[PDB]
Amino acid sequence: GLMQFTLPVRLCKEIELFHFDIGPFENMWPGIFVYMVHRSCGTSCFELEKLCRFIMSVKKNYRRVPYHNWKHAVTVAHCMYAILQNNHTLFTDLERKGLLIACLCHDLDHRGFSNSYLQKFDHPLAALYSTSTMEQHHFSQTVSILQLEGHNIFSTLSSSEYEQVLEIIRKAIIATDLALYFGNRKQLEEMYQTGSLNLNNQSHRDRVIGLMMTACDLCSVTKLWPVTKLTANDIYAEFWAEGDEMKKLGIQPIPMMDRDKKDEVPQGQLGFYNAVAIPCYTTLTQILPPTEPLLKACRDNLSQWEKVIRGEE
């Protein structure tokens, strides 16, 4: 009951900032997550015995892939922590509980392959879930872990609060399907501009939570340049492996996934910042002004990629 997690001074201060890197010490990541749950939610939100068992089971079900791994899970959860802490009064107790768990779970059992590759391979999961294939799988894995004995961190919620939190987590995880992000941000753009955006409208909150999930999920593009540049290698390591597997099915992959076209990466990143990241953090900043540091850091990293192209690095 009276057992706080405490971090060393430098982490205690930097964890509050959007651009915090959780570091290379894997054994500190569970503690960093519980620290965030306690400050974001309260020391009473979850039974610590049950939370610790949930965290370690989630860790076990992330694979040793270059990018879509346990470090990504905790990194995405930290970005959600920073958004929630800078927007104290905008979110219910249930939303704070649900979204930190949603982010930790959002890529459970990722294999390093896109929805497209599962479909072209004819993976069983593509037969079970025709769209948002991996994301329906991630939510499935989440419910499975919740139903292990001793793992149900929501057991102290009322029946109806329980159904609400699982529904928050389901929409949150599905929203991390980037194919759905484009239309969701366009709707939020129209609603913000025409002034119809209403956070007491549940379908509106859903859209806003969806954009937060995209923002947290892409938050590696919002770190200091050295962190972003080295994380870019990890995600390209997966893309190129997928390109290799596309070629094994006798399909020329998109340039993004063709390791023969590494020269094209700098311009590929420009397109991604311009088409995806900058629009995402812009719309998020318009709706949630205190999230501006993510937009600022993202613009700084676009600028660093422009410098790469111009031979200045």
Ligand SMILES: Cn1ncc(NC(=O)c2nc(C3CC3)cnc2Nc2cncnc2)c1C(=O)NCC(C)(C)O
């Ligand atoms: C055409 N292209 N080039 C690259 C690229 N994606 C990325 O670089 C990238 N994608 C993601 C999510 C989608 C899986 C996360 N992080 C990413 N980059 C990154 C960079 N630095 C640090 N961390 C992460 C796209 C693309 O995914 N385009 C979007 C679409 C396929 C819808 O056209």
Ligand SMILES: [Mg+2]
């Ligand atoms: Mg994902």
Ligand SMILES: [Zn+2]
């Ligand atoms: Zn992710």
